[PDB]
Every structure is written in structure tokens, then in C-alpha cells.
């Protein structure tokens, strides 16, 4: 025992845990240390810890539980048991264990950080944020605590975005960007995780475009000023960014999005895939060929790195939708073969088939997708579009309504098509204002358009539809602002090309604006 303890503590401080585990196991199994082992729990603790750095987490649970039964006051045994429970998908048990360990030793620091991570995993952002803020206040030198705080901030912002809290998501994104700027400026610590977090945060400003002017362009400059194959295509550089003119807010947002991907073979494949995804987002948002070329180049390199992931094939198929349909078809087939449980590839193939005006193939694939994922709102949208193209009107309306109900506000296209269909079905139908169903449909369409304008404003067709709906709903105060924005957009559009065909819509907009007054 005494000699065994000496050897164990000598090997534990090397550190070298395999030998310590072997010695503890041969001491326990010897059955000659009966009386001594009922007062101390160091051998079981060493065995559990050694299993813990071996990443065989489930094997150390029993050892930590035995060591805790022997001594219920071991804080490190509780911490090890909780960190083992977390890796086994036992998050609530780990939360309770971390609470117990904190209760024994309130000054313990890593326990609070682990508890905050677990609370974030189960979806308790307020308590975890408070814990991590207090921990970072107590000791700001630790890099892991700051990275964890940024991680929790980003996850909370994304969860709020998915839940429909679009106004606090941008505020939490700004807080995350400020924290990242603080980290890079003061700690001078760089890692791939923080740049991935920044890129995830930057998508919130592009997605919520009505709040894009709030982007902290001052902190981002210092973030990109305190740290070549693809540079010749996109030509996106910090110097070119600074010395630029006649550039819109959204374009600057997308160019900022494509700098964290370039400032960070599995790791290299992920790096190039991230750059390609950012460039694909920029190409979809701005519609310029050089972004498409850069995205294809990055996707090709990432495929040449691993070629065993579905997402790279989906991205390659998306980036080559118009240049060639056979290439997109092959990419989508390969992606589906790689991961058969993903329902997005079938929808992408359906959209590709619809873009080539092949209705039967799209109908067949959408029937299969509906059999596969009935709860998603995209197959219903595709079927509604197909039936609208064919000529059926009642079924198209029913499918649009079902898609809108299933979307639960998470789809812009569902809202737009539902509003357009409702307006089309009730524009010259000869109905009165005493019908509850029609007024409720108009109210739902107005609410859907209000939600739509928060993500993609300055859309002429949606603005006109909303103006008509608000005129029907007697909401003359919102229609004034909407018509002012529409008039401004039309004036800006017609003051650049210097055309004259826009005078026809100008008169109609002026007449509607006069009706609103």
C-alpha cells in the first residue's frame, strides 16, 4: 500500500497514467489490501482518470461511482463522473453532478464551465451565460473560458433566430463580434474555432438584411488587421475592401463573410469546404460569376482532399446548376448515395429537374420525398408549384396553405407564395367585408408579409402585394411607409439605367399612393 501509493504518485506526476492504472488495478485485484482500501479512494480514482484520458468514457463511470461510494467528499471524483456522463449522452445527470461538485467546493472554476456547457447542450442559455460571464470575470486570462462564452453566445443567437426572435439575434451577434474582437486584440490567441464562430455569426446579418446597417464595421477592421490560389478569382482582399467605393451594404457584408473562411486532410477539406460555402452564399446573394468560379474551385479542391462527404457534393451540385445539368445530376446522385437519410438532396434534384422544365421527373421525386419526410414544408411547396404550372388552382392553394402551416415562419418562400396565392384568390372574387374567413386570411397574409420584410426588404413584388393587402385591411398607416419605401426604390432604380419604360409603373404606384393618402 505505502510503496504502492509512492509508485502511483510518482507515475501520476510524470504524468503517465497507463502505468498508474496498471499498478492500481494490480493492487485492487490482489485481494491483499482489504482494510486499507475502505478509508481511501485514490486507486479507483486513478483507474477512472486513466480511462478518462484514454477516451473510453463509459468504462470509467463505474470506477468513479465506486470511488465516490468509498469517499463521498471527493470533488475530483464528482468532476470526473460528470465529464464521463457528458460524453455518454447523459447531460442531465452530468448537470446534477456538476451542481453537487459546485456545492461541495464553490471556488472550483472548471466545474462551473462544464456545467455551463451542459446547460447550453440542453438549451438553458440564461443560466449558462450567467455562469460563463461570472467565470470570465473571475479569471480573464484563460482562453478556453472565453472561447466557451463565445460559443454559448453564438448557439443562443442561432437558437433565437430559428425560434423567430430576429431582433435579439442581431444584438447577441454584435455582442459575439465584440467579444471576438476583445479576444483577438488582447489575448492575441488565434484558432480555427473562433473564426468558424465569427463566420456563423456573420451569416445572421446577411440573413436579417433589414438590420444589416448595424454590422460593427469598426471592430471587424481591427479583427482583420491584427492577424493565394483562390484570391485571383474573387479578388477579395483587405486592402481592396478598405479602398472601395460605390459598394452596397449587403455586398460589404458578404465580403466580410468571405474573410473569416480564408483567415482560419480532414481539417484542410473542412477549410476549403467552408470557403466554398461562403462563396456560394455570396454568389446566391449577389449573382456575380467570379463568386461561382471561386466556389467551384474551392469545392473541387475539397473533393480532391477527401471526396467522402455528402455536403461537398451537394455544394458542387448547387454551384453548377445552370452551367450544366448533367454535372448537377451526377453530384446530387453521388450525395444521395453517400448519405441516404438526408432529404435535401432529393429536393435539390427536384428543383434542378423543374429548372429544365421536366415536370414528370419532378413530380416523381417529390412523391418519393413526401413519402420520406412528410413534416418538411419544401416538398409541399414543390408540388404546389408543379400544380400551379399545370393549371389546377384548388389543389395548389391547399398545398400552399399546408406548406405555410408546416413552415412555422422558418421559410421566406412559403410566406411569399402563401401571400401571393391569398391575394390572387381574393382580388376579384366578389366577396363582402363581413366574411370572417376572408378577413382572417387577409390578416394572416399581412402578418406573413410583415415577417417576410424583416429578412428580405426592398422587394418590389412583395411590397406591392403588401400595399394591396393593407389597403384591403384599412391599415393606412403601414401602407404609407411601405409606399414611401417603394417609391424610393423605384426612383433609385430608374435614376441609374436612365431608362423610360419605368414610367408606366410609376403612374400606378403614384395612384396607389394617392389612394393611401
Amino acid at each position: 500500500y505505502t510503496a504502492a501509493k509512492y509508485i502511483t504518485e510518482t507515475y501520476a506526476s510524470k504524468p503517465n497514467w497507463q502505468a498508474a492504472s496498471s499498478i492500481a488495478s494490480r493492487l485492487i485485484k490482489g485481494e491483499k489490501a482489504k482494510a486499507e482500501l475502505r478509508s481511501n479512494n485514490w486507486p479507483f480514482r486513478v483507474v477512472g482518470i486513466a480511462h478518462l484520458e484514454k477516451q473510453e468514457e463509459s468504462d470509467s463511470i463505474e470506477w468513479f461511482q465506486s470511488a465516490l461510494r468509498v469517499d463521498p467528499n471527493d470533488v475530483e471524483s464528482w468532476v470526473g463522473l460528470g465529464q464521463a456522463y457528458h460524453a455518454c449522452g447523459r447531460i442531465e445527470a452530468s448537470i446534477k453532478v456538476f451542481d453537487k461538485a459546485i456545492q461541495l467546493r464553490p471556488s472550483h472554476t472548471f466545474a462551473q464551465y462544464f456545467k455551463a456547457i451542459s446547460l447550453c447542450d440542453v438549451g438553458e442559455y440564461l443560466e449558462s451565460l450567467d455562469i460563463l460571464e461570472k467565470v470570465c470575470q473571475e479569471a480573464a486570462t484563460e482562453e478556453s473560458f472565453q472561447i466557451g462564452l463565445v460559443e454559448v453566445l453564438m448557439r443562443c443567437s442561432l437558437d433565437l433566430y430559428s425560434q423567430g426572435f430576429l431582433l435579439k439575434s442581431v444584438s447577441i451577434a454584435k455582442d459575439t463580434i465584440e467579444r471576438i474582437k476583445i479576444i483577438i486584440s488582447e489575448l492575441k490567441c488565434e484558432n480555427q474555432q473562433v473564426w468558424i464562430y465569427l463566420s456563423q455569426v456573420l451569416r445572421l446579418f446577411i440573413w436579417i438584411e433589414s438590420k444589416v446597417d448595424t454590422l460593427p464595421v469598426e471592430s471587424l477592421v481591427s479583427i482583420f488587421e491584427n492577424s493565394e490560389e483562390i484570391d485571383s478569382v474573387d479578388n477579395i482582399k483587405i486592402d481592396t475592401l478598405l479602398d472601395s467605393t460605390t459598394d452596397d451594404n449587403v455586398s460589404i457584408a458578404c465580403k466580410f463573410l468571405i474573410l473569416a473562411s480564408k483567415y482560419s486532410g480532414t481539417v484542410r477539406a473542412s477549410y476549403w469546404y467552408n470557403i466554398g460555402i461562403s462563396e456560394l452564399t455570396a454568389f446566391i446573394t449577389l449573382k456575380e460569376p467570379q463568386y461561382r468560379d471561386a466556389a467551384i474551385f474551392a469545392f473541387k479542391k475539397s473533393i480532391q482532399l477527401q471526396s467522402n462527404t455528402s455536403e461537398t457534393w451537394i455544394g458542387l451540385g448547387i454551384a453548377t446548376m445552370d452551367i450544366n445539368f448533367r454535372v448537377s445530376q451526377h453530384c446530387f446522385i453521388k450525395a444521395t448515395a453517400l448519405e441516404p437519410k438526408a432529404t435535401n438532396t432529393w429536393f435539390n434534384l427536384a428543383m434542378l429537374g423543374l429548372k429544365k422544365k421536366d415536370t414528370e421527373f419532378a413530380q416523381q421525386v417529390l412523391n418519393k420525398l413526401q413519402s420520406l419526410a412528410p413534416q418538411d414544408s419544401s416538398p409541399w411547396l414543390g408540388m404546389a408549384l408543379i400544380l400551379e404550372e399545370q393549371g389546377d388552382i384548388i389543389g395548389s392553394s391547399k398545398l400552399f396553405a399546408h406548406s405555410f402551416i408546416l413552415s412555422n415562419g422558418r421559410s421566406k418562400a412559403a410566406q411569399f407564395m402563401y401571400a401571393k396565392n391569398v391575394l390572387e384568390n381574393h382580388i376579384n372574387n366578389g366577396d363582402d367585408e363581413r366574411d370572417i374567413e376572408t378577413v382572417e386570411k387577409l390578416t394572416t397574409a399581412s402578418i406573413a408579409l410583415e415577417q417576410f420584410f424583416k429578412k428580405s426588404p426592398d422587394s418590389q413584388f412583395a411590397l406591392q402585394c403588401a400595399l394591396l393587402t393593407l389597403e384591403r385591411l384599412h391599415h393606412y398607416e403601414n401602407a404609407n411607409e411601405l409606399a414611401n419605401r417603394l417609391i424610393g426604390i423605384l426612383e433609385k432604380k430608374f435614376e441609374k439605367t436612365q431608362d423610360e419604360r419605368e414610367l408606366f409603373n410609376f403612374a400606378i404606384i403614384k395612384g396607389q399612393f394617392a389612394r393611401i393618402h
Binding site: D213, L215, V217, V221, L241, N249, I252, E491, L503, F506
Partner: peptide, 23 residues
């Protein structure tokens, strides 16, 4: 005054500015 309005009568950003100022 607007160019389109003038033509009709005859026939009858933030992020960039802040970026330049900061630099």
C-alpha cells in the same frame, strides 16, 4: 427633387461611409 419626377413633369452606403471615416 428627383430625376424620374423631373422627367415625368417634362412629359406632362452607411457601411461604406463608416469604413472610409474609420480608416
Amino acid at each position: 427633387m428627383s430625376l424620374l419626377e423631373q422627367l415625368a413633369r417634362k412629359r406632362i452606403v452607411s457601411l461604406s461611409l463608416k469604413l472610409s471615416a474609420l480608416k
